[PDB]
Amino acid sequence: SGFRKMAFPSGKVEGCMVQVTCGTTTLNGLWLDDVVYCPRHVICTSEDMLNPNYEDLLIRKSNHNFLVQAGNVQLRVIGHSMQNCVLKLKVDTANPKTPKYKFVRIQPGQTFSVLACYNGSPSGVYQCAMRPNFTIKGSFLNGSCGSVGFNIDYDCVSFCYMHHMELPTGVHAGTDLEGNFYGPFVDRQTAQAAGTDTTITVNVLAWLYAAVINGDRWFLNRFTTTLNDFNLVAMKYNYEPLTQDHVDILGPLSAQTGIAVLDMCASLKELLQNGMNGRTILGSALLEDEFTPFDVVRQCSGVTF
Amino acid sequence: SGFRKMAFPSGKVEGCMVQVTCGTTTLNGLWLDDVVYCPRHVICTSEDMLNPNYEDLLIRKSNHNFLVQAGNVQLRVIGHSMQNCVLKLKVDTANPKTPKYKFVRIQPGQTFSVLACYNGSPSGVYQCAMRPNFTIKGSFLNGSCGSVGFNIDYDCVSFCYMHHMELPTGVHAGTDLEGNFYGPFVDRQTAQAAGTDTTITVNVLAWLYAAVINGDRWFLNRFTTTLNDFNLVAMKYNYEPLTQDHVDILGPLSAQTGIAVLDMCASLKELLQNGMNGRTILGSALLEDEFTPFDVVRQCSGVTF
Numbered sequence: 001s002g003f004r005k006m007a008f009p010s011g012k013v014e015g016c017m018v019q020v021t022c023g024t025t026t027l028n029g030l031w032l033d034d035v036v037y038c039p040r041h042v043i044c045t046s047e048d049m050l051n052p053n054y055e056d057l058l059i060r061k062s063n064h065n066f067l068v069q070a071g072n073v074q075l076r077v078i079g080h081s082m083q084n085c086v087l088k089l090k091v092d093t094a095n096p097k098t099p100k101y102k103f104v105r106i107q108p109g110q111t112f113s114v115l116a117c118y119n120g121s122p123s124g125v126y127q128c129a130m131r132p133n134f135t136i137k138g139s140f141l142n143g144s145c146g147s148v149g150f151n152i153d154y155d156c157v158s159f160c161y162m163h164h165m166e167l168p169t170g171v172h173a174g175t176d177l178e179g180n181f182y183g184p185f186v187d188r189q190t191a192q193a194a195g196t197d198t199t200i201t202v203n204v205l206a207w208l209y210a211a212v213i214n215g216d217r218w219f220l221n222r223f224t225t226t227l228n229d230f231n232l233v234a235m236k237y238n239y240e241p242l243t244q245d246h247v248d249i250l251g252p253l254s255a256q257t258g259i260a261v262l263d264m265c266a267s268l269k270e271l272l273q274n275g276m277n278g279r280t281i282l283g284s285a286l287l288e289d290e291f292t293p294f295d296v297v298r299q300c301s302g303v304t305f
Numbered sequence: 306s307g308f309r310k311m312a313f314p315s316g317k318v319e320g321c322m323v324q325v326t327c328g329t330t331t332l333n334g335l336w337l338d339d340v341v342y343c344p345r346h347v348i349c350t351s352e353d354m355l356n357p358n359y360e361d362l363l364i365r366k367s368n369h370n371f372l373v374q375a376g377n378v379q380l381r382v383i384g385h386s387m388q389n390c391v392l393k394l395k396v397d398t399a400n401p402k403t404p405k406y407k408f409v410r411i412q413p414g415q416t417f418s419v420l421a422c423y424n425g426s427p428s429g430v431y432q433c434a435m436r437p438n439f440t441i442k443g444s445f446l447n448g449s450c451g452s453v454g455f456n457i458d459y460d461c462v463s464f465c466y467m468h469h470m471e472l473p474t475g476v477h478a479g480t481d482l483e484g485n486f487y488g489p490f491v492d493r494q495t496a497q498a499a500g501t502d503t504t505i506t507v508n509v510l511a512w513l514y515a516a517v518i519n520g521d522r523w524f525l526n527r528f529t530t531t532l533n534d535f536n537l538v539a540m541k542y543n544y545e546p547l548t549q550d551h552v553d554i555l556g557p558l559s560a561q562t563g564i565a566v567l568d569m570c571a572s573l574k575e576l577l578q579n580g581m582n583g584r585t586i587l588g589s590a591l592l593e594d595e596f597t598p599f600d601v602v603r604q605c606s607g608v609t610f
């Protein structure tokens with residue numbers, strides 16, 4: 001038993017991290033086969049960041065302007081191209097440590113592991129979720145740009161995030177591995193703000209089921225509710241609407257604990273209207289929303305990679 | 306910006322995990338150079354667990370009774386010896402993926418990363434602390450015995466924990482890599498219970514300094530305290546006594562933020578008395594004690610906001 005915020009083992013991703021330098025900017029790159037993927041803002045100075053014309057900045061660069069370092073070895077750049085907000089550096093050597101991989105775009109509410117890197121060297125791994133407002137509450141300092149988010153499905157690494165920027169509120173924004181930003185963000189030094197965030201309802205419910213599996217049942221009650229009445233309640237507390245898809249997805253956890261999804265919704269309704277009253281759930285005084293229904297099933301079953 | 310519970314990148318430890326089988330029992334082993342380290346209870350049946358005579362059970366075993374599997378390869382056992390509660394299996398192949406390593410015994414309050422494994426296969430990584438009562442609040446199911454705790458400051462892996470058992474309250478007990486248990490526990494199914502746990506005061510203080518660094522000061526006050534008056538109050542809330550060593554260790558964080566340790570102790574005294582009043586500190590409604598002074602310096606910026 002026990003319930004922790006758990007990240008995937010990072011080893012398959014550590015073997016892909018490289019350092020990319022162009023001029024005075026140094027950031028992280030992802031080396032898969034003979035290509036290094038990194039944020040295209042590596043070609044910008046602080047003067048350019050105000051209003052960059054990325055194609056115009058890129059046309060002035062040659063292959064030898066990009067310095068790529070893998071461990072203590074210098075990789076030779078033999079080509080370069082831009083795809084959305086990501087730069088693709090063709091290198092001479094294929095990464096012998098390239099794992100089985102896919103590039104996947106995730107949806108808000110989905111979780112992933114972040115391997116925080118500085119100078120192409122991994123320093124930490126943590127778990128987080130794509131918020132409904134498309135930001136992530138990460139932990140990144142200067143030099144972390146190019147750090148990646150991923151999930152592991154059997155032996156295949158699914159890369160879903162590449163770090164690009166920090167917003168004024170201390171939250172983070174980035175792209176998928178095809179360079180498409182999550183959220184209405186741009187890679188420029190301009191006024192940008194995170195939108196009003198909401199709580200991931202299906203994830204809080206999954207975490208309530210995890211608490212029941214771990215022996216925390218004080219919040220259970222005899223009541224049930226309807227999906228229409230619960231959504232009228234949830235909308236008042238800045239919770240995301242719960243759909244029939246979310247109810248279907250919580251089916252296995254409902255069968256394991258014997259608590260119907262709308263039965264658990266009535267517990268969440270009472271927790272939202274009354275609070276915890278000095279109590280905790282899984283060592284937390286807040287309702288936790290960064291564990292998906294699948295994360296809960298995985299952690300309470302022991303799936304390996 | 307941001308503050309997350311962050312684990313070390315697990316790759317260097319993933320390349321050491323093996324599966325160890327003796328009869329009907331199967332658990333995890335740590336393969337470093339030509340030795341596999343695993344809990345000695347791998348030689349026990351559930352009938353041997355009440356009063357096992359390990360020396361008598363071990364003398365009846367030969368090298369070929371121990372099945373060690375590394376990935377899809379069978380390792381040949383050429384020797385075996387017991388050191389305290391750990392079994393050391395001499396194998397015929399040195400692990401080519403052996404990182405630079407040390408075995409270190411940690412003290413209560415210290416944090417480390419746990420690579421949870423099943424059948425010699427890593428499933429997840431999380432951060433945790435050695436509680437004052439020598440237990441850890443982990444996430445471990447049946448088959449996780451032999452999973453290890455470690456730190457990776459610089460390029461050297463310091464192994465500090467090997468998982469052995471779950472106590473009746475759902476918390477976990479284990480040994481250092483020399484087989485010495487942390488706490489008054491035994492690898493025996495005896496009526497043993499964790500002592501009453503306490504909050505790691507020096508770690509809560511470190512985490513309050515992390516919140517100041519990230520730009521938050523709502524909890525500070527104009528008061529100070531003597532160390533003894535602070536300890537008289539702290540012990541009423543089940544907080545560990547703060548020693549002069551802890552005050553010395555908080556020196557760097559005190560210098561960076563400009564807040565004297567005994568002044569931060571005064572904010573802590575007031576937080577214990579008043580609660581948070583609807584507010585959070587670094588996204589938490591509870592006072593966090595699983596970040597050491599060293600973890601805060603490692604994660605946080607050197608420039609206070």
Ligand SMILES: C[C@]1(C(=O)Nc2cncc3c2CCCC3)CNS(=O)(=O)c2ccc(Cl)cc21
Pocket residue numbers: 041049140141142144145164165166167186187188189190306
């Ligand atoms: C400076 C950069 C950025 O956010 N880097 C970064 C990323 N993560 C954390 C931290 C920073 C910087 C200092 C704090 C900590 C560069 N990326 S960008 O998308 O071009 C961009 C766009 C706009 C702005 Cl205002 C900054 C940036």
Ligand SMILES: C[C@]1(C(=O)Nc2cncc3c2CCCC3)CNS(=O)(=O)c2ccc(Cl)cc21
Pocket residue numbers: 001346354445446447448449450469470471472491492493494495
């Ligand atoms: C049975 C074992 C144990 O706790 N395994 C285990 C270890 N970690 C987690 C989980 C379990 C079990 C199922 C749930 C989850 C084996 N280790 S031991 O030190 O010999 C020991 C000592 C005392 C007792 Cl009461 C049991 C055990």
Ligand SMILES: [Cl-]
Pocket residue numbers: 410411412415
């Ligand atoms: Cl220590």
